[PDB]
């Protein structure tokens, strides 16, 4: 049931439940994916796709607000604030020795 899962967006979905009351059931997306047009077909994939043909009702997941995702499905107002940024390694410890003089 709903007890296999934990996280931020499971705590969010419980807190949206006590306000509204819509008691939910997690069916995770199978072909695990978010959404993209395949550039030859135009079909969406994953959680953007399963909202188009009304298979599930919500998308409580890191589904970013993209200009091409908004034309197709309806996003709510945000609950976090992203940004694209670079994950690189922290440089070595330079380790000045005891005999550094």
């Amino acid at each position: 049931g709903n007890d296999r899962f934990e996280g931020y967006c499971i705590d969010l979905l419980r807190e949206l439940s006590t306000i509204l009351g819509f008691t939910y059931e997690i069916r995770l997306v199978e072909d695990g994916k978010y959404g993209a047009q395949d550039d030859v077909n135009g079909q969406w994939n994953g959680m953007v796709r399963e909202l188009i043909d009304h298979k599930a009702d919500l998308a409580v997941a890191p589904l970013a607000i993209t200009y091409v995702r908004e034309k197709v499905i309806d996003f709510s107002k945000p609950f976090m604030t992203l940004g694209i940024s670079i994950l690189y390694r922290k440089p070595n410890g330079t380790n000045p020795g005891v005999f550094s003089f």
Binding site: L12, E15, I19, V48, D57, A64, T66, D74, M80
Partner: protein
């Protein structure tokens, strides 16, 4: 940050729950709930110094 974006409980096109959830996101944001949950999960274990 290169750009700015954000998340969102995505609903189908023309769903009624586009409005009833953003009432309950803006409510949970002024009550501090959306910062207690971010702090409870992104707490990590800490990094020592940036000297």
């Amino acid at each position: 940050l290169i750009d700015s974006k954000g998340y969102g409980v995505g609903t189908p096109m023309g769903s009624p729950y586009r409005d009833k959830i953003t009432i309950a996101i803006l409510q949970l944001q002024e009550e501090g709930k959306l910062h207690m949950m971010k702090e409870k999960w992104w707490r990590g274990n800490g990094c020592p110094e940036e000297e």
